[PDB]
Symmetry: C2
Subunit: 227 residues, 2 copies
């Protein structure tokens, strides 16, 4: 915002105007929604982001060319605000994007949560995405108990998960409620000291989501296609 | 039982002994279980029945040959108890039989109930057979609420039926509870006169089971295979 050279060529200004207008705030918000589990919103932003980076690529090629032939763009010789590395590092957000319907975008996000080791968000998405998949097959509906299509769709995935994927459902609720919960059954003393109940290890959770969650999810979705 | 000729040849006696021993009571019991909806028991009897008729065929061929060459078996010339038509008509029970596991035998029975126009029994079997199909896929279990595998398996088929096959579930409960029920909502007067609630027609029920029940059931089972 605070970047404006006093003397600027027609081609320099034309591309700097584009650079000054890069919505870095939309990228930060995208990462915020992903971290805090606002999965629908993150996925809805994907197309907007796709355009943000498609332009940033165009600007980076032009700026890269400018700095490669730096002898012709001596107007930038004193500038300290435009840092090529800051913009080039931002282009990595291109990896977080995919094309397709919002369900396919959420499916990709599940894999992103797995790679990033965000166990809580990965397991909740693996639990709720098959309900949406189911809802889509039935012509659509809203995630609300008053919606009949949702009521039955949720009952199907919940009972199928409790029937075949008992582990998935257990890890999900434990990570969702944390340490102080009925899901972990800790014991509080007269002295104010707590002794954990189930003491679920770092390895059992890491191994399950990193090695089984995707294979399990793909089988759950495979089953729910026939619906 | 009351059939015994005074003079009997070695080949005549050998085959009459077999005829006298035909378990017609097992056939009557088979038809009783089918009519009263004891579907598991009817299906379990199928192999026994298969042997009953396999022998009755053998005896009928020999007796038919005896009566075709009646001049050689003049010992039967006065007999009134052995009626070829009674035994030959019994061989029609061969059509009610099929080979395969008890689930495949129950599947065939569903089609038998459809052809026979036993709407009540057909719809209850169409509702409960997918639970057993589901139970089998999960390694087996007992039809009891204390059985976890059953609990979830039933919840899946019940919610899938309420989600996609709303009609099937409605006709089932109506036929199961009959006229005087909450399923039909009749109204009783001060005078002791009742006015039906939903008045579901003979045609809507006939058309549904005779034209849609099998296509619908086959899709329900097709879905539950992926489980």
């Amino acid at each position: 915002s605070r970047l404006n050279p006093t003397i600027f060529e027609e081609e320099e200004k034309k591309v700097l105007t584009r650079v000054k207008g890069t919505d870095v705030n939309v990228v930060i918000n995208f990462l915020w929604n992903i971290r805090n589990g606002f999965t629908v919103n993150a996925v809805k932003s994907m197309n907007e982001l796709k355009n943000i980076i498609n332009q940033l690529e165009e600007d980076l090629e032009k700026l890269k060319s400018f700095y490669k032939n730096w002898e012709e763009h001596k107007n930038f010789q004193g500038e300290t605000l435009l840092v090529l590395s800051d913009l080039d590092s931002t282009l990595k957000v291109k990896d977080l994007l995919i094309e397709g319907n919002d369900l396919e975008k959420l499916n990709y996000l599940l894999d992103l949560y797995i790679k990033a080791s965000i166990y809580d968000k990965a397991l909740s998405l693996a639990r709720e995405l098959p309900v949406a998949i189911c809802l889509n097959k039935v012509g659509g509906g809203m995630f609300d108990d008053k919606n009949e299509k949702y009521k039955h769709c949720n009952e199907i995935v919940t009972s199928y998960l409790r029937l075949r994927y008992s582990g998935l459902m257990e890890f999900r609720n434990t990570l969702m409620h944390g340490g102080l919960s009925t899901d972990m059954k800790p014991n509080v003393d007269k002295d104010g000291n707590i002794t954990p109940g189930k003491i679920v290890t770092k390895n059992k959770i890491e191994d399950f989501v990193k090695r089984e969650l995707r294979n399990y999810f793909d089988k759950i979705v495979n089953f729910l296609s026939s619906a």
